[PDB]
Amino acid sequence: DIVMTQSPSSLAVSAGEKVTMNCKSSQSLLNSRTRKNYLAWYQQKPGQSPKLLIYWASTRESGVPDRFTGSGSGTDFALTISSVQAEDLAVYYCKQSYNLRTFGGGTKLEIKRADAAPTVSIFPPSSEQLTSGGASVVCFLNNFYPKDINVKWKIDGSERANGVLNSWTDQDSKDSTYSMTSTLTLTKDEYERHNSYTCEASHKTSTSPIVKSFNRN
């Protein structure tokens, strides 16, 4: 029976920097007949299917950039990325095939980039939703770094924090940013009792919040 641990669970590296992730087997995956290690690496990009990178531990698959090197033997294996590109954002899986197949838990690779401020957009409920009796107010915080970020919703100057759901995107594969959406949901009636709607974005890129507002006007 074969147990695959992977290490680390996650890390972030800057473009150009080097990257090593590890793969432990509970037993040797060396087939003495073929003298090969039955160990493969898969890259799985956000939203995408797993793609093959390396098989037999060391063998790189066609199309795969040379910056990707698979190493090791026995019970210890490693995927090295020599000069990381933004496109390299993904979870990497090792998998043995010496005794059926077993995947490791994965190494999630994030990219480090310079801090960048969010572009913030606010949107009032559509009249379609309203006539149906609901009021969702939505706020986009796009293309910022780093991920950590706080949103404040304020109605007529007072912070409401119920009815608010937040959602972050995977990191962007090109520009290495993150975007976040924040939706405050109210009944139409409650929405109609108030005048000013404000999305307040607090990010380390500025001591001052980014402030987008609309009036039910």
């Binding site: 029976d1 090969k36 039955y38 493969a40 898969y42 799985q44 299917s49 797993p50 793609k51 093959l52 098989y55 037999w56 698959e61 899986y93 998998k95 095939s97 059926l100 197949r101 077993t102 995947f103 490791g104 838990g105 994965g106 572009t119 957009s121 606010i122 949107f123 009032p124 409920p125 559509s126 379609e128 939703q129 149906s132 969702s136 939505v138 986009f140 796009n142 759901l165 937040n166 959602s167 972050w168 995107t169 995977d170 975007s179 976040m180 959406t181 939706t183």
Partner: protein, 217 residues
């Protein structure tokens, strides 16, 4: 050219059964083992079983976690693979992948399909409501709010795919058994609203196709 396509995914009640299919093309089917792999959202891949090729007489192997509960079979006249799933539970909820496996030489899952998502829930299929997000700068940002559907997934495009860059689709969040997500699109303020912008949203669970034009407020 090699193709693998999974189908059959969607909502099944707990205790229920479901069979998935995997249609293939562009390679010699009977030469290959074929594998099924799953992945609970935000989680690791898990190999579940294969059925060997023609050389080994199309025998099946299973991971201990589904051995006895899941069944694999292939139709060699059609280049098609199946996974029969019984007595489903919540932890069976996951994207399911067919993958081309062993052929006699290489130890690699050379190709994978797009995957099909299976949700095991007593909750009921609910079609989404789709709302326009309409709003100064040189770029302008629009959105569509896809609210209250079940189960996952939905797809969002902008102008039937012809608007691909500057698009952020946010991961759905769950609440009272309804998912909610948004997609933002950023275009030159030059172009809107002089040029129509429309989101195209699909929810296969409910055969829902929605087009929504973003019209100025």
């Amino acid at each position: 050219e090699v193709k693998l396509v999974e189908s059959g995914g969607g909502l099944v009640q707990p205790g229920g059964s479901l069979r998935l299919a995997c249609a293939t093309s562009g390679f010699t089917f009977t030469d290959y083992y074929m594998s099924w792999v799953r992945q609970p959202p935000g989680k690791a891949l898990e190999w579940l079983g294969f059925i060997r090729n023609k050389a080994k007489g199309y025998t099946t192997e299973y991971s201990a976690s589904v051995k006895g509960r899941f069944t694999i079979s292939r139709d060699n006249s059609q280049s098609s693979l199946y996974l029969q799933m019984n007595t489903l539970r919540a932890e069976d909820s996951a994207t399911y992948y067919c993958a081309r496996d062993h052929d006699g030489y290489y130890e690699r899952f050379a190709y994978w399909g797009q995957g099909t998502l299976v949700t095991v829930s007593a909750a009921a299929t609910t079609p989404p409501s789709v709302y326009p997000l309409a709003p100064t700068n040189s770029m302008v940002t629009l959105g569509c709010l896809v609210k209250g559907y079940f189960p996952e997934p939905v797809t969002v495009t902008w102008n039937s795919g012809s608007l691909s860059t500057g698009v952020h689709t946010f991961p759905a969040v769950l609440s009272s058994d309804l998912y909610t997500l948004t997609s933002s699109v950023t275009v030159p303020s030059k172009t809107w609203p002089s040029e129509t912008v429309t989101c195209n949203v699909a929810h296969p669970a409910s055969s829902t196709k929605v087009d929504k034009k973003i019209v100025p407020a």
